[PDB]
Amino acid sequence: VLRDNIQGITKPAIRRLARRGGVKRISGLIYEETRGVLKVFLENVIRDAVTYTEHAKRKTVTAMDVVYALKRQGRTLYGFGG
Amino acid sequence: LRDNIQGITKPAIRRLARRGGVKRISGLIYEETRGVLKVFLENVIRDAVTYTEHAKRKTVTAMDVVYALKRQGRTLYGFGG
Amino acid sequence: RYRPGTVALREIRRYQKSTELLIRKLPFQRLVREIAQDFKTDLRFQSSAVMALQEACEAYLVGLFEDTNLCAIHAKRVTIMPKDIQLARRIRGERA
Amino acid sequence: HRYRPGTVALREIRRYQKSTELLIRKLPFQRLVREIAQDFKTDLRFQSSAVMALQEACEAYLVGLFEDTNLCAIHAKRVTIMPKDIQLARRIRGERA
Amino acid sequence: ARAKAKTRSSRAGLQFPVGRVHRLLRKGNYSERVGAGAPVYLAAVLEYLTAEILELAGNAARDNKKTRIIPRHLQLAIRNDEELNKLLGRVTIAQGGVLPNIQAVLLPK
Amino acid sequence: RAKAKTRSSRAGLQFPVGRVHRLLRKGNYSERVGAGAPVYLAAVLEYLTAEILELAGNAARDNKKTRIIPRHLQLAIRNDEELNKLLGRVTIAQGGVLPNIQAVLLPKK
Amino acid sequence: RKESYSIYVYKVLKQVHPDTGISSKAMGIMNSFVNDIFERIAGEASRLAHYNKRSTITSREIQTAVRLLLPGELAKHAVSEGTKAVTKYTSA
Amino acid sequence: RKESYSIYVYKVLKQVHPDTGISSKAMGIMNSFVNDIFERIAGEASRLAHYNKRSTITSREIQTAVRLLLPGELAKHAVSEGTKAVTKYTSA
DNA sequence: ATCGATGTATATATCTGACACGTGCCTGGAGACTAGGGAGTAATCCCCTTGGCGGTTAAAACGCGGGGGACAGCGCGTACGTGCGTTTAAGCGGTGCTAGAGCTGTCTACGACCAATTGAGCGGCCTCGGCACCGGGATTCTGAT
DNA sequence: ATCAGAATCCCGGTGCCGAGGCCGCTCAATTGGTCGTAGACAGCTCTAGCACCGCTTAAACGCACGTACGCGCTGTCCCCCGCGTTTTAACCGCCAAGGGGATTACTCCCTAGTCTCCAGGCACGTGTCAGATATATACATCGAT
């Protein structure tokens, strides 16, 4: 149903993220590498969150599932627990 | 007692770097390595001594060191028994 | 016409003062739904769940870019390259 | 028949990556451990296995750090590791200076 | 007849709920039994840490001329304090932003 | 009263189901433990042990050795991608390192 | 009945900054922080009781867990606050 | 009297490598590995039971904890082994 | 220096929507009392940690020459930044509809508990084979020619 | 290509000490019965997640042009490596002592569990004021001269 959605992470958005990281000049090959890195990270988080959702017999991924998935990857997130 | 950090000699640091695959070593590396090792050891020993004191013991055991390493994400295998 | 780097520094200052999300919401939501199709079909998402995913992802990428910038400055460059990202991820212990 | 610089270093790398023995002398390391621990509690006793475990952890940590330092040195088109390489590796790891 | 009920928080001179912390300790599967003073000690520690963070965030808000604390002020308070940053190192504050920081070598000649 | 059978033999396992059940009860893990949880846990532990032991035995044979030492366990773990991912933050005592020299350091020509 | 720490956090804020308010998003951050620190201290104290073959969690386990988890000067003042609270409570 | 996994590790070794022995130091490594994995899986199963307001750890929690903790193809085979063992156990 | 373009900082007014306070009730916290078992304490024993000494030899320390590697400077060519005109789709507001999350009740299967029994696993003893160490011959590899 | 010499590999003999097997016994796992409640399942409420449409406008996109920068090359010199000689201290063994860790027994006081009671803390409601937006305008900053 959905295809080529990683392109939706556009080059200006990646540039903005790198600006917040303090980067001054960006190589043109950075954008595809960043897209791949983001896809890997998202795949790992979403896999754990969906495992939590399946365990609960739910069909909806809740924010608590995402919080627990992040927590178990050593990336604790504040502000979504309630 | 006093000047023990110099007991970690230059040839020993060279051996550790060789096991890490290092081919050439700058002359300023030895002091930096001594500082790094001192910090690491201080953290682990502080945790282990806290574990020893909680048990009201006077002797640091290997189990205390294993727990101290575990709580720093440095899990050690082969000393649990 | 400004010299190259002035606008970049202004953009750095602007985006380091603010806190809003830098990725557009609808494309990210579509990406999240596409990725989750490989794990379970007909999955629904709370809006707060997608927002949590976006916050985590943007924080992760910004931190990665900070480390990448350090690696680039180590090689006496001002331009970040794929090898800088690879080095930073390798030192972090992340999967290649 | 003097060996060129780097040949003996490569031989040493091969030898020390093939073996598993500890590379720090035991008696100086034990003195170091006892000296450091004195600042937290006086009149402390140590099991021998405790000091052995500490030494194993320390050597493993330093070897991993030297691997990351070597990668940092190669990134800057050098073959010599320098304190800046150790500092960068420890900073990217998230350890404290 | 029964004496007037006195909250365990008020007995210990605390704002944080001692009884709720006790109930949470009993139901968390932490141990078979919970001592009388463990909830008091835990509540005091939690209240102290909350006070420290709130004080730093209030200072950050006042310096910004704001009268309300937002997640940005909490992030600024945490990241600018060495010990709090060490305790909350692995944590992401949602909408907290980053510390403004530009490398010196990147600055104009 | 019948001839008593170990639960491990019923499940066709070498690892002890009863000891795993007792360790789960002593553990402070949950109020109650189901009947199949120790069997499942014992089977998983046995499978992981068999995987590591098979790889370590192959490493020992490749070195013309008949006894597994910590070096062989380290070589088995670090050469297998899944096991390396599982045991990534683990230090094997007396295990050494993988032989690995960066290609840029190799002699020219 | 969705329990939280908002009312006690608000009381603490009014104690340290009587003039200053807090937004709801920042209050959620505070709730997450309190829950996280509770989980950390409780888990360390549970491990300490299990390591020493004890079935009870007392203020000693809490103090040792605080010493293990909190850095530097944070641990000293937190230990002081906990000891003061326990002493005051023990005297009614 | 200190319990360990040496006799079951040796039985498994004799099943996979009949002619191969093991030294005591490697046995200690194996015992540490077994205890570490048991603790990881039990902690994750306890968290899963707590998250869903359940008081029982069953094979469903062990299975989910395995899927969470083991990587890639390790999780598939471990899940298959656990299911086969439970099926054999309940039939007998 | 120097003036121009311009993005940014300061001053004041408006409003709106989110924070701060008030109310009812109910459900979680407090007081009282009893039982029992967890933990504190004292005595004991024996093991394992610390200290000392002598030797002897491997390792560490030191000195020195040299070559190779770090670093600075320069040239060049290309790839990135910036600005502008066009297009694309994100965001928003509104509506409709249904999947499914959350809650309640019923009931039964399943897991805790207890007492009796027995066989698995532990600790201690003994032996014999795997591994290490040595010595000598063969091959490899390195560096200068 | 050549050839000398150091390093390494291989093959065999010796020995020693640790892994592996055997046996007694004791205590943990097993079996059988009972009963209480956790959770599985069905049913109902009504929330919120999804789909669709239309409009607006900001962001994204594509192109052109210039120059800043990455990278390759060369020269210099200094600082690391390799090696021989002297010193020093680690390691090993052997002996002594006593400190403190583990165990057992005894007592009591601290915590769980139950019941009763009541007042704290949470959903609902609503007003007023903190900050965002708007506009005007000063003003510091860049950058070519």
Author numbering:
A (entry chain B): 21 to 102
B (entry chain F): 22 to 102
C (entry chain A): 40 to 135
D (entry chain E): 39 to 135
E (entry chain G): 10 to 118
F (entry chain C): 11 to 119
G (entry chain H), H (entry chain D): 33 to 124
What did the article's authors report about this structure?
In eukaryotes, genomic DNA is tightly compacted by the nucleosome, in which roughly 150 base pairs (bp) of DNA are wrapped around a histone octamer composed of two each of histones H2A, H2B, H3, and H4 (Luger et al., 1997). In chromatin, genome activities, such as transcription, replication, recombination, and repair, are generally suppressed and epigenetically regulated through chromatin structure. Single amino acid substitutions of histones substantially affect the structure and stability of the nucleosome (Flaus et al., 2004; Kruger et al., 1995; Kurumizaka & Wolffe, 1997; Muthurajan et al., 2004), suggesting that these alterations may disturb proper gene regulation in chromatin (Kruger & Herskowitz, 1991; Peterson et al., 1991; Sternberg et al., 1987). In addition, the canonical H3.1 Glu97 to Lys (H3E97K) mutation has been found in cancer cells, and reportedly reduces the nucleosome stability (Arimura et al., 2018; Bagert et al., 2021).
To overcome this problem, we reconstituted the H3E97K nucleosome with the Widom 601 DNA, which is known to form stable nucleosomes (Lowary & Widom, 1998). For comparison, we also determined the cryo‐EM structure of the wild‐type nucleosome with the Widom 601 DNA. In the wild‐type nucleosome, the sidechain carbonyl group of the H3 Glu97 residue forms hydrogen bonds with the main‐chain N atoms of the H3 Leu61 and Ile62 residues. We found that the entry/exit DNA regions of the H3E97K nucleosome are flexibly disordered, as compared with those of the wild‐type nucleosome.
